[PDB]
Amino acid sequence: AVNSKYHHSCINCGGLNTDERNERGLPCEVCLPEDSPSDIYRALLERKTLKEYRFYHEFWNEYEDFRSFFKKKFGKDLTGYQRLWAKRIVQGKSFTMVAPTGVGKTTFGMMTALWLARKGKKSALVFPTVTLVKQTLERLQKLADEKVKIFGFYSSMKKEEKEKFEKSFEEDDYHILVFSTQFVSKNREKLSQKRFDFVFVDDVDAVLKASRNIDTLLMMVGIPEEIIRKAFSTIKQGKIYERPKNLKPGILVVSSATAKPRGIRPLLFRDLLNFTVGRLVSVARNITHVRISSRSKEKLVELLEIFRDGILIFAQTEEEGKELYEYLKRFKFNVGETWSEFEKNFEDFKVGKINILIGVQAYYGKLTRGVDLPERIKYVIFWGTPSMRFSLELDKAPRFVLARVLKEMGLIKAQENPDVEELRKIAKEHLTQKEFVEKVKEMFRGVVVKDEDLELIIPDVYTYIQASGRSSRILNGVLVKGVSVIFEEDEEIFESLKTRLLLIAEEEIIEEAEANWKELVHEVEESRRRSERELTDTSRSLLIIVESPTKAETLSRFLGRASSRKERNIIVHEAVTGEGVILFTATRGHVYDLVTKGGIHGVEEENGKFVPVYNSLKRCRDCGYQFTEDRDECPVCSSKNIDDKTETLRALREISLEADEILVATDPDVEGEKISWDVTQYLLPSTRSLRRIEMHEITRYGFKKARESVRFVDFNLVKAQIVRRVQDRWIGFELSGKLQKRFGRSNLSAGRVQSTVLGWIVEREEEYKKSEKDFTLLVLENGVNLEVEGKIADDVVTVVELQEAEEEKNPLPPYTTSSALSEISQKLRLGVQEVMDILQDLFEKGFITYHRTDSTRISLEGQNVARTYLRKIGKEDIFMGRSWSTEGAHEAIRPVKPIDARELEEMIEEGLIADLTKKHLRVYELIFNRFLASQSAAVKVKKQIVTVDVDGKRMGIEQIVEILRDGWNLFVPLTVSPRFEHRTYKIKEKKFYKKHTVPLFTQASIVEEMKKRGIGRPSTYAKIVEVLFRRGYVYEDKYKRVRPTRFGVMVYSYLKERYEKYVTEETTRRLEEIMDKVERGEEDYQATLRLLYEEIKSLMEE
Ligand SMILES: [Zn+2]
Ligand SMILES: [Zn+2]
């Protein structure tokens, strides 16, 4: 711990407790004065302070009984899925049963109903078919005692049982009632007037067939139609609805939606039960994609002879399907078809009578609308790449083509245009077919433009993913292996497909050379027989906490957002993986912050040591004002509509009970570690299993490698966060006050660094007007222009000595935060803050590596990205992998995927990925080009060093002339220059002037400078500049230079006159150095706090 206080962190009294106690999962000293108590519950009860801890005790005890009961009545222990479901059941929570192929939902439903009836609770079990009612009641009756009132209802019911069920359901206080969905639909009013504690729905689709059934099931727990209709109007509007806090419903449990959850009705579950009826979108895949260069049926024969069994062939059309079918039939292979004898061959393949199934892209995907046996399909063969083909003529042209063409050409003025109308609009404007196809070849990058036969081929990645997916799912807790083979000869098509597969599924396609068929077939078969074995369960549930919503969204993109529980302030998503379930949620920033209330501006002092005091953050959803103090309304606009991180914290504490293991996935910096600690410390009394993961990339790889890096919270980083925060708080407050008494305004000084930088700008104004040195520009005859010192008047330049040398020029290292901000904000006409934000969205959308780095280091994987991209662009001989740095916390800002900006624009306009502005694309382009240059070969150049005499001055001039051999100059331009000959060049034009030696600052120049001086860190750079702008201390002019205002000058003048020590660059740098030493556990936390205090105490007197 760091010995600090958190305001609502007590597990029992719900109040203030120290970091150190929560760490030991203890209540506050008020609740329990003792150091190391014997047993918490017992001791709380003894001191008569037992309050909220009871909930947890009773929770644990009410669950461990369930588990115990289940382990007694049934075979063995609970599966991970059933474990999480059980923990949700004792909380009375309603949910979908998110899980793979037959994890035993019916077993859980039964044992739940049984365990509840054991207490006196009444439950109902709903099934689609009338046969399932029979089978379930059968299994129930033999395990249930006489104490349990069991009834049933279905089609083939008896003559006295049908009425027995009705009278008993009317008065006789039943326990468990097993019936069909038909009964629900038919006897709506009867059930609606009854109250159930537990309702188990086996098939959600059958019950969602009617709209009436939603209201029926909702009224089966005790919810009036008033709340239902009000919520209905709210969901008809387009916003969320709030359940009355005074409501205690039963437990509704359903399975995953097979078909799409169509309609408005399911939203009632989102407000009344806080669970969404999700569809099973399982992205869990273990497929090996191999590509064969030729559509040779001989290769196909050889492959088929290796695979032998359970092969699925996909043809583009049925014609090539029939052709392939004939060729294989002739070569004596047990084969089937989908076009002729669909059902017969389908089931014959299902059983094993057929080894090879040949289908079409559109035929199979629609015939298999029912079953689709996964335990049979090991290998998927693609006879050609699945793709969408369009014609490139002035006629036969699709909408999106003429759209992207005319929008760029200039015609598209936005008024929605009919296709044939657009054809007739382009029929006059740059109209030839030749001109057209050329505009298409020029615009469309990341598709295949067959300009030969006038065609456009767009590989259907989705279809490939689904179809390939048919060879790998989760069976008996085992994610079985599958091989997907593609037979493609067109390199352009294969490359396009590969890029969009890497983009969406992050899955690679390998070549036939780098693939051992014997080994692969073996892995497949072995995993299959491993799943055939008797399962002993390894599945666990896992909670992953991140700070920003974007991270959660892109995480859901590769984990698959099946269902989303709305828990107070947050939205926790759930996903199915091969290792078990996986819950992930976003905090939506910081939770705690230093209190302004007491001690030394929030920092208290006891026993010679400093104690930081934190309180939950509150943000008014109206005006946007943030505060720490506990108030009912907004201190500014007096509004009650606020966001309280204490609710978020409570929500986390709730979720933490269901999860077996927890991982905090905040950013890999001091900020992130501090948040991670504010969270882990708070949760620590609730869950014993809490660890830390640092994701440098927001992708499956970043995540896997992040979990390789699993560790506990590093207190040195937390300590460093604290120190920096305390410095800004103390110095900021003191200086700001001193300014309140001089310039009227309250909040003015954000810290020391800010004032230092502003000082740089202010005095720069002075030293700029003084650098005014007289100069002269010279346009030389059939040569370059030369910039030389003022007084020249000879009109002739003589060449004195001339020497040339061959040299290989190295590219610039990859972007770091400083580099990226400077170059990008210079090349673009943007502020460093705008750039920093674009970078943040870029990292958070998993497109680049961590954007807050002071290292240029590049891993073998980064180098590999560069390599594959170069191999893709054909210029792979120019690849030169460079680590760039050994000393590195993180890597430099680089792309995560070998995809350029143009291809991304294509994927965006196409609709594969979304949410990227033009600015994002341009920034990405800059990062990309920098990185590749840094990974491309050294450009071999012949440069000359010309010594020239101009007006009795021997002045050398070094210039590159010939580029002997290309390299990184393809990404980042390399400028040549006309050769000088050892003669006399005459001056054409002399443009005399006086431009300044020391130029003004630009935002880029300021960042560069503070990086050059050792002031600020990667996180603070842009924020510092922006603060300077927000406070009105600085402005930008015509040519976008940074200039101080009247106010800024007044302020820095005051601060320099009086408080020069606390604004001096030497002091700022010395402190920056020391704090950074604290971050590495090289300098003492409490000691530097003592230092900052000792200078603050000195400042309170001046
Ligand atoms: Zn307490
Ligand atoms: Zn407000």
Coordinates of N, CA, C and O and ligand atoms in Angstrom, one line a residue, residues 619-627 633-642, ligand 2:
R619 N -19.2 13.9 -11.8 CA -19.3 14.7 -13.0 C -20.7 15.1 -13.3 O -21.5 14.2 -13.6
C620 N -21.1 16.4 -13.3 CA -22.4 16.8 -13.7 C -22.6 16.5 -15.2 O -21.8 16.9 -16.1
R621 N -23.7 15.7 -15.5 CA -24.0 15.3 -16.9 C -24.5 16.5 -17.8 O -24.6 16.4 -19.0
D622 N -24.8 17.6 -17.1 CA -25.3 18.8 -17.8 C -24.2 19.8 -18.2 O -23.9 19.8 -19.3
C623 N -23.7 20.5 -17.2 CA -22.7 21.5 -17.5 C -21.3 20.9 -17.7 O -20.5 21.4 -18.5
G624 N -21.0 19.8 -17.0 CA -19.7 19.1 -17.1 C -18.7 19.3 -16.0 O -17.6 18.7 -16.1
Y625 N -19.1 20.1 -15.0 CA -18.2 20.4 -13.9 C -17.9 19.1 -13.0 O -18.8 18.4 -12.7
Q626 N -16.6 18.9 -12.7 CA -16.2 17.8 -11.9 C -15.8 18.2 -10.5 O -15.3 19.3 -10.3
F627 N -16.1 17.4 -9.5 CA -15.8 17.7 -8.1 C -15.7 16.4 -7.3 O -15.9 15.3 -7.8
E633 N -26.4 18.2 -5.3 CA -26.5 18.8 -6.7 C -25.1 19.2 -7.2 O -24.1 19.1 -6.5
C634 N -25.1 19.8 -8.4 CA -23.9 20.3 -9.0 C -23.6 21.7 -8.3 O -24.4 22.6 -8.3
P635 N -22.3 21.8 -7.7 CA -22.0 23.1 -7.1 C -22.1 24.3 -8.0 O -22.2 25.5 -7.5
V636 N -22.1 24.1 -9.3 CA -22.1 25.2 -10.3 C -23.5 25.5 -10.8 O -24.1 26.5 -10.5
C637 N -24.1 24.5 -11.5 CA -25.5 24.7 -12.1 C -26.6 24.2 -11.2 O -27.8 24.3 -11.7
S638 N -26.3 23.7 -10.0 CA -27.3 23.3 -9.1 C -28.2 22.1 -9.6 O -29.3 22.0 -9.1
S639 N -27.6 21.3 -10.5 CA -28.4 20.2 -11.1 C -28.1 18.9 -10.3 O -26.9 18.6 -9.9
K640 N -29.1 18.0 -10.2 CA -29.0 16.7 -9.5 C -28.5 15.6 -10.5 O -28.1 14.6 -10.0
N641 N -28.6 15.8 -11.8 CA -28.2 14.8 -12.8 C -26.7 14.7 -12.9 O -26.1 15.2 -13.8
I642 N -26.1 14.0 -11.9 CA -24.7 13.8 -11.9 C -24.3 12.3 -12.1 O -25.1 11.4 -11.8
Ligands
ZN2 ZN -23.5 21.6 -13.2

